[PDB]
Every structure is written in C-alpha cells, then in structure tokens.
C-alpha cells in the first residue's frame, strides 16, 4: 500500500500523467477547435481535389497544414500541441473518390517517456492514433 501510494504520487507530480492526458485532449481530441477546423478544411479540399497521398501527405504539405492550423488555433501554440505529429501509416497511390477511409493513413503519435511508457503503452498510442 505504501508503494502504491508513493507510485500514484510520483506518477501524478513527477510523471505529469494528468498533463499527458490534458495534452491528449488538446491535440488528439481536437480541443483546439481552430486547428481542427483548418485541418478538416485542408483535408476535404485535398480529398475532393483528388490529391494523391504522395502529394497530400508530402512533408511540406503536412507541415504547412499543421503550422497553419496551429497558428490559427488559440491552443495550437501550446506545448501540448507541440507533442502532436501528423504521420503516414501508408502512402496511397491515388485518393479513392468518395472513400471515407481516404485519410486513414494519417496517424497522430504521442511520445511517452520512461516509466510512463509502461503505462502509456505503444498499443495505447496506436489506439489513440
């Protein structure tokens, strides 16, 4: 019981588990509504224009979209928003028209340091993505 109590205190104060959950809410849950709106508009413009993953998921395009969404977001400049990264699961050759899963190649990863990576597992980060 003493070990468990001290571990809870360590995780909350030292490992900032609550702060990690807050970061997940800010970035992964699209709490920055302006960033989410800009991302959604850019995504639907690219999908409707038929941009390929190599064109849409190009690091220059993804970085520009992320930068614009963060600059337009009140929370986009927050250090919790800085933990967000737009990654590609796979590179489609062509954006399939009217496919709802067209943008399923994008993954948002959250980095967990030791020992938090014991609790925030790679499976958990994959589910969040």
């Amino acid at each position: 019981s003493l070990v468990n109590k001290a571990a809870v205190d360590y995780f909350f104060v030292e490992l900032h588990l609550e702060a990690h959950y807050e970061a997940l809410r800010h970035f992964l849950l699209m709490e920055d509504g302006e960033f989410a709106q800009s991302l959604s508009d850019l995504l639907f413009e690219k999908l409707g224009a038929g941009q390929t993953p190599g064109e849409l998921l190009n690091p220059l395009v993804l970085n520009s979209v992320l930068s614009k969404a963060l600059q337009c977001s009140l929370h986009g400049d927050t250090p919790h928003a800085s933990n967000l990264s737009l990654a590609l699961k796979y590179l489609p050759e062509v954006f399939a028209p009217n496919a709802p899963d067209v943008l399923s190649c994008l993954e948002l990863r959250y980095k967990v340091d030791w020992p938090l990576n014991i609790v925030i597992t790679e499976g958990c980060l994959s589910k969040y993505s």
Binding site: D32, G33, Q37, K68, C72, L74, H75
Partner: protein
C-alpha cells in the same frame, strides 16, 4: 481557422444590439470597455478574431462597422461602454444628424451616400480577421435608420464580397407592440427585400417575440427597442459561444447551420434556448437536466420567434439541433430523448432523416455562468413562416393604408408609392410559404 463575423450596427436598435454584443463578448473574454484584456482575463481560450480585431497585442477592437443615417444612435454608442470597442474609423455617422425620418428609403439613401466609408470600415474589420467568412449585419427592420442603413450595409457587403456569404440578423417589427415607427411595416418590407436580393440568409427576428419574452420571462412590461436589441445580442452571444470558445465540436458556422438550412431559399431559421432564465434570476444556479432543458425549450417563452396562431396549417419543426454548452451528462441527454419520445415533444419532417444534433461547447472562463448547462437550438420550423407572413401582412396593410408614408415620401424610393414595400411583402410571403413547405414531403420538388 474560425469563420470570422463582421458585425454591422445600423440605427438605434442595431447600434444598441452591437453595443450589447460587444459588452457580452468583452465580459466573456475579460476585455475592458476600452478593448484591453483585463489582468484577470488570463484564459486566452476565447476567439476574439471571430468578432473582434486586434489593433495591437493588448487592444481588442470589434470587427464592427457602424453605419447610421441618424446621429442619435452613434452618439448613444459613443456614450455606451462599447464606444472604445469599435474602431472609430469604422463608425459612420451622418453629418446632417437629421436621421432618416423613420423612413427606410431615407436610411438606405444615406447608406448609399456613406457606401464608400462603410465598405472601407467593413474591409478594415475584415483585414483584422484571419479567416473572415463574411459579414453579419445586425439591425432592426422597423426604424428608419436601422432599416435603411442595414439594407445599405447588406448591399455593400454583397457588392464587395460577392463570393462570400452575407447573413443578416434583421429585427422585424413587433406586431403585438405598437411600434413608435408607424412606417415600420414599410421599413420591414424594404429590409426583407434587401435580404432577399443582397443577403444569402436572413434570420427573422420578430420584435414581438422579444417583447413577449421580456414580459413573460424578464418581467419587462414594455420592452424597449434597446432592450429587445440587447436581448438579441445576448441570444447571439450564447449561440456564438461555440464559435468564440473553440472546442472538439461546432468549431465552424457551417457545421452548426448545415442541419438548419435545407434549401438556399428555405433559409428562414427558428431558434430555441434552454434553460431560459431572466437576467435577474442568475442567483439560483438551477441544476437543470437535459430532460429539464428539453422541457423548458418547448415553452413558448423561450422561443425567439413570434409565430401567429395559424389555425389552418399545422406548422411544425422540420429539424432541431441543440448546441448545449456547460456541464451536460450524456445520460441526461438520453433521458431527455426518452421523455421527449414518450411525450412526443418533437415532430420532425417525414420525408428525410432529421435528428437533434448535439454540439458541446466550452463556457467562457472569465464569465461566470449562472447555469450549469446552457443551450442554443437552431431549428427549421414551419411556424417561422408565421413571423414572415405576419411581417408581410403588416407591410401590405401599411402600403395599402399609406400609413406614415409622408415620412417615407421624403425619400425618393418611397416618395410616390410603396410598391417596393408591397413587392417585398409578396416575396417575403413566398419565402414564408417555402419555409412552411419544407415541413412537407413535397419540399423535395420545391422550386
């Protein structure tokens, strides 16, 4: 990015509504009456850029262009707490101070004379907007200044931003209250004309409903035009909180309005709010449940539209979306839906899918909310036609009676006849009928 809204305040009522809107936004964001963020306003979570522009890193200026044909309203604004909120270069006051004589046509002609200045103001406010969607004009249709200048502002916004949407909040005259603006039905007709020709969406605000709400809910025996405009500004603030406090949902205007506007012509929306509380009753934070909220929403005292008692047409809501802000339990929403179904509290259109959309929005951290849960409803309801039909009938009655036309006869547009008012009334009647038609299965073939 947020869809920024430029607020155009026209005439006494429009300027009062703009002033109260800027006051409410300042209070929610912790902005002083001078446009400076208060030291207590540490929650940088509000979206000022939707409605306000930054003049500097510290001074917030409303993205508002003030256009009036009568100096009285501009002087009242400069004596209001929001006098420093608006850019003084974005405030147009007629030098002659003679007003529009309660004539919509005179106000419109003055707006045309101040068209360049007004559109320069609108462009200056737009440049302060990072992703300006378009302009929202708040005005009354019953006066001379607020009606004519509001129509002028709508026209100039359509001319300058022809590829941008132009929505108006046009206050139609109270039909249960004796309007001091005897020419109010003509002014209302001219404003509806301008909304039909130069606006893309007209939200009908019946001053009769504002007065009824003030009487029954605010205990105001005689709601003033200023009090009605301040109520409208409070309603707009509550409906726009999700725009001003970005979150997981309802981060854009189009997402909120998509469920409400079935056709470009069928753009007459009804509103609902819950829980409804009087400004004086802030003291008791009622633990209103979603079931309690939904029950209060069905009360006519909280509806911002004064529909006539049509006995022949069973006017109904086609769809209702309630955006609820504050502490809301999803289980309370479920219980609310259960109670509504058992009570058959909402009828929907039978010809297509319709539901209650739920948007969750954060509250302003700087403004204490007297309500644990609050909500705005946007709904397409055929009873909204009764407000438009009543406005059209009043316009036709005034034109047919030449009532107060001598004040209008001073302006060239209304000097010889009110035929423009009667044609406007007919167009508004057709719009009302289309909004009523959208409650029916044959709406698929409308137009």
């Amino acid at each position: 990015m947020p869809r920024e809204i430029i607020t155009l305040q026209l005439g006494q009522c429009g300027n009062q509504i703009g002033f109260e809107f800027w006051k409410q936004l300042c209070a929610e964001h912790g902005i002083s009456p001078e446009g400076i963020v208060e030291e207590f306003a540490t929650e940088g979570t509000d979206r000022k850029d939707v409605f306000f522009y930054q003049a500097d890193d510290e001074h917030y200026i409303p993205r508002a262009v003030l256009l009036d044909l009568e100096p009285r309203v501009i002087h009242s604004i400069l004596n209001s707490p929001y006098a420093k909120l608006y850019n003084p270069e974005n405030i147009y006051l007629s030098e002659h101070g003679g007003g529009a004589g309660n004539n919509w046509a005179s106000g419109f002609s003055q707006g045309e004379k101040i068209h360049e200045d007004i559109f320069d103001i609108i462009d200056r406010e737009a440049d302060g907007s990072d992703s300006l969607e378009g302009f929202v004009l708040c005005h009354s249709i019953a006066g001379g200044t607020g009606s004519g200048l509001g129509s002028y502002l709508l026209e100039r916004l359509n001319d300058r931003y022809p590829k941008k949407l132009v929505q108006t909040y046009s206050v139609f005259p109270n039909q249960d209250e004796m309007s001091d603006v005897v020419v109010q039905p003509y002014n209302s007709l001219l404003t509806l004309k301008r909304l039909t020709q130069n606006a893309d969406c007209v939200v009908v605000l019946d001053n009769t409903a504002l007065n009824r709400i003030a009487t029954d809910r605010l205990h105001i025996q005689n709601p003033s035009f200023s009090q009605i405009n301040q109520l409208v500004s409070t309603i707009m603030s509550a409906s726009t909180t999700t725009l001003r406090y970005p979150g997981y949902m309802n981060n854009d205007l189009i997402g909120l309005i998509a469920s409400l506007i079935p056709t470009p012509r069928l753009h007459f929306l009804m509103t609902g709010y819950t829980p409804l509380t009087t400004d004086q009753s802030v003291a008791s934070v009622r633990k209103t449940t979603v079931l309690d909220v939904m029950r209060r929403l069905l009360q006519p005292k909280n509806v911002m539209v004064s529909t006539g008692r049509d006995r022949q047409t069973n006017h109904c809501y086609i769809a209702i979306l309630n955006i609820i802000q504050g502490e809301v339990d999803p289980t309370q929403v479920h219980k609310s839906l259960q109670r509504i179904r058992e009570r058959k509290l909402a009828n929907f259109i039978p010809w297509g899918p319709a539901s209650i959309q739920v948007a969750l929005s954060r509250k302003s951290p700087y403004l204490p909310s007297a309500h644990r849960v609050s909500g705005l409803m946007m709904a397409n309801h055929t009873s909204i036609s009764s407000l438009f039909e009543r406005t059209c009938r009043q316009y036709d009655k005034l034109r047919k009676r030449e009532a107060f036309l001598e004040q209008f006869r001073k302006e060239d547009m209304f000097k010889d006849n009110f035929d423009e008012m009667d044609t406007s009334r007919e167009i508004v009647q057709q719009l009302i009928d289309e909004y009523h038609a959208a409650t029916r299965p044959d709406y698929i073939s409308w137009g």
